[PDB]
């Protein structure tokens, strides 16, 4: 029941209503993440959402969804209480400016700054967060999704109120839902309670990929954390699933897992000849129009970072040459399962349906995605590999024990032979 | 092997956690950004800074050499013949 409803105003209510859903959630999203911020006001999108999500809930679970592109509040409740959750967020949104005007941001700013620092403490999130920025340095997409401590500390109610009035508008806002409930009852409940100001959809600020390396050599950490990625296909790109399939070819790995010695990806067998890497993760992060395709890796040995990058990048070369049908068949199946896994929780699908409805304007159910992935031949992957991987610029990030990570030229040269 | 230089994993450098490095893929950068300005302004700056240390010793040595060469030439010309006999 993916059906959509457009209110008297231009707000679209998209609901993935489905029986046998364990719990139901509703969330109002407006397409203004760190993408639509600038360094002086960075993190305002997260701060304003946290304030709204901090409002008292009538037994519902208000949580804030913060992302590079989109941002909104999500309420999760039992299927019988969904209508109350819907009326709740409309009350939160209609009173958004009034709530923010009187709200004291000091406590929320501490929470947001604490979040951002905690992101920096975790090496993976730091590496990924730096990676995304280094690729898009100079554009708004480089801004951290939750902002930075110094940027947040300068935020004031005026900054957010300007932000909400710019972005929290009918054309730039969507309502998402999922669970076992009647779509019409939710839509009627929202219409009778949601009152928001009209406005034009803010133009999405452009961003362009720039191959670069950002090194945060941190010799006190026990392991070396690195990520290397290229300009992968983003949303609304015909290769969006193809990029995911390519990533699943190399898949994941964790040296201390029972599956390590028996996992399919070629790179997994290669790295164990010397226990080169403890864990690595191939991913295809996709934004509204830009995506980053690559891997994240944690190396627990100072002397094997260069060995890993050499072998991992050498394996990337096989995308354009000698890629096996078995791998593509494996990657197609693995992505399909991973795609379906993401959409299990009603909360997860509510976030997903909001993302697509905002950033691409239409959504594909698992039926369509499976029909697309199933049609991916080996050749299509190889053409994609040559287009997006072979001799294409890489962006490199790394924080711990980076001393062995050879400089950019060495790694980049491995991308072609 | 307490070599004061090790391999890449441990080059013997001390802990340097709080420093960050930044570079752009050469596939994205200019090769000749500073070539024109550098070859003139920067080269002249280096030459001017290092000049005195080359000039002063060179002036001293070349002055001594010129004095010696001129004296020898005078000796081997006719007007110096007698002194060539006197010195030898």
- The alpha carbon of residue B14 is apart from the nearest alpha carbon of chain A, in Å, by 9
Structure's resolution in angstroms: 3.3
* Separation between Cα atoms, residue A361 and residue A402, nearest integer Å: 42
Beta bridge partners of A415: none
Q: Which residue of A has its CA nearest to B15?
A: A219
Cα separation of B2 and A131, whole Å? 37
Q: Which residues contact A316 (CB under 8 A, 6 or more apart)?
A: A250, A385, A389, A415
Smallest CA–CA distance, residue A374 to chain B, in Å, is 35
Instruction: Give the span between the Cα atoms of A285 and A234, in whole angstroms.
Output: 7
| DSSP letters spanning A40-53 | GGTTHHHHHHHHHH
Which residues on chain A are in Cβ contact (under 8 Å) with B28? 210-212, 393
Nearest Cα residue in chain B from A304: B9
- Name A251's Cβ contacts closer than 8 Å, sequence gap at least 6: A263, A264, A265, A268, A282, A331, A334
Q: Measure in Å the smallest separation between the Cα of A120 and chain B Cα atoms.
A: 13
Domain count, chain B: 1
Q: In B1-88, which ranges are E strands?
A: 21-24
A122 Cβ contact partners less than 8 Å away, ≥ 6 residues apart: none
What experiment produced this structure? cryo-EM
Domain ranges for chain A = 1-194, 200-417
Pick the residue of B22, B27, B28, B29 with the most A CBs within 10 A to test the interface with A by mutation.
B27
Q: Which chain B residue has its CA at the smallest distance from A133's CA?
A: B22
Nearest residue to A367 via CA among A16, A20, A23: A16
Provide the chain B residues 29-88 that lie in CB contact (below 8 A) with chain A: none
Tell me the DSSP string of A236-292.
T-TTHHHHHHHHHHH-EEETTSTTGGG---HHHHHHTTTT--SEEEEEEEE-SS-EE
Query: Closest Cα partner for A65 from A355, A283, A285, A290?
Result: A355
Please list, in sequence order, all residues whose beta carbon lies within 8 angstroms of the beta carbon of residue A204, skipping any fewer than 6 positions away.
A31, A35, A36, A69, A288, A289
What is the chain A residue with the closest CA to B20? A216
Query: Which CA distances in Å does A67 have to A33, A105, A126, A327?
Result: 6, 20, 15, 32
Would the CB atoms of A393 and B27 count as touching at under 8 Å?
A: yes
Query: Hey, are the CB atoms on A412 and B23 less than 8 Å from each other?
Result: no
User: Containing domain of residue B10, as a range?
Assistant: 1-88
- Please give the C-alpha separations between residue A261 and each of A224, A255, A301, in angstroms, as whole numbers: 22, 8, 19
């Amino acid at each position: 029941g993916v059906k959509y409803t457009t209110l008297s105003n231009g707000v679209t209510v998209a609901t993935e209503t489905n029986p046998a859903a364990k719990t139901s959630s509703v969330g109002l999203f407006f397409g203004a993440g760190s993408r639509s911020e600038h360094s002086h006001s960075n993190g305002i999108s997260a701060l304003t959402t946290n304030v709204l999500a901090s409002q008292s809930a009538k037994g519902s679970l208000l949580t804030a969804k913060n992302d590079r592109e989109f941002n909104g509040i999500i309420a999760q409740t039992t299927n019988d209480n969904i209508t109350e959750a819907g009326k709740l967020i409309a009350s939160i949104a209609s009173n958004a400016v009034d709530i923010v005007e009187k709200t004291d941001l000091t406590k929320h700013k501490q929470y947001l700054s604490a979040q951002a620092s905690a992101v920096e403490a975790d090496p993976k999130s730091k590496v990924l967060s730096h990676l995304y920025s280094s690729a898009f340095q100079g554009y708004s997409l480089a801004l951290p999704t939750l902002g930075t401590t110094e940027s947040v500390e300068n935020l004031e109610n005026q900054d957010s109120l300007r932000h909400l009035a710019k972005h929290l508008v009918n054309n730039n806002t969507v309502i998402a839902a999922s669970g076992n409930f009647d779509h019409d009852k939710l839509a009627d409940a929202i219409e009778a309670n949601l009152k928001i100001a009209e406005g034009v959809k803010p133009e999405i600020k452009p961003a362009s990929f720039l191959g670069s390396e950002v090194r945060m050599r941190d010799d006190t950490l026990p392991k070396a954390y690195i990520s290397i990625a290229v300009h992968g296909e983003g949303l609304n790109s015909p290769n969006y699933y193809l990029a995911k399939v390519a990533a699943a070819i190399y898949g994941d790995f964790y040296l201390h897992s029972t599956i390590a010695k028996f996992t399919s990806p070629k790179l997994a067998s290669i790295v164990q000849e010397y226990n080169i890497v403890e864990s690595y993760n191939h991913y295809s992060k996709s934004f509204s129009d830009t995506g980053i395709w690559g891997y994240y890796a944690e190396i627990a040995d100072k002397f094997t970072v260069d060995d890993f990058t050499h072998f991992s990048l050498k394996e990337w070369n096989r995308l354009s040459i000698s890629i096996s049908e078995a791998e593509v068949a494996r990657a197609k199946a693995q992505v399909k399962t991973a795609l379906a896994k993401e959409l299990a929780n009603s909360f997860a699908v509510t976030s997903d349906i909001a993302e697509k409805v905002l950033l691409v304007g239409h959504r594909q159910s698992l039926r369509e995605a499976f029909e697309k992935i199933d049609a991916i031949k080996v050749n299509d992957v190889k053409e994609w590999g040559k287009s997006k991987v072979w001799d294409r610029d890489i962006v490199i990030s790394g924080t711990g024990l980076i001393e062995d990570l050879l400089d950019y030229n060495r790694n980049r040269n491995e991308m072609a032979m | 092997p307490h070599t004061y230089m090790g391999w890449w994993g441990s080059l013997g450098s001390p802990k340097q956690k709080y420093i960050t490095q930044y570079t752009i893929s050469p596939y994205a950068a200019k090769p000749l950004k500073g070539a024109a300005y550098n070859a003139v302004f920067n080269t002249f700056r280096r030459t001017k800074n290092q000049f005195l240390y080359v000039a002063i010793p060179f002036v001293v040595v070349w002055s001594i050499w010129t004095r010696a060469r001129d004296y020898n030439e005078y000796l081997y010309t006719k007007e110096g013949r007698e002194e060539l006999e006197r010195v030898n």
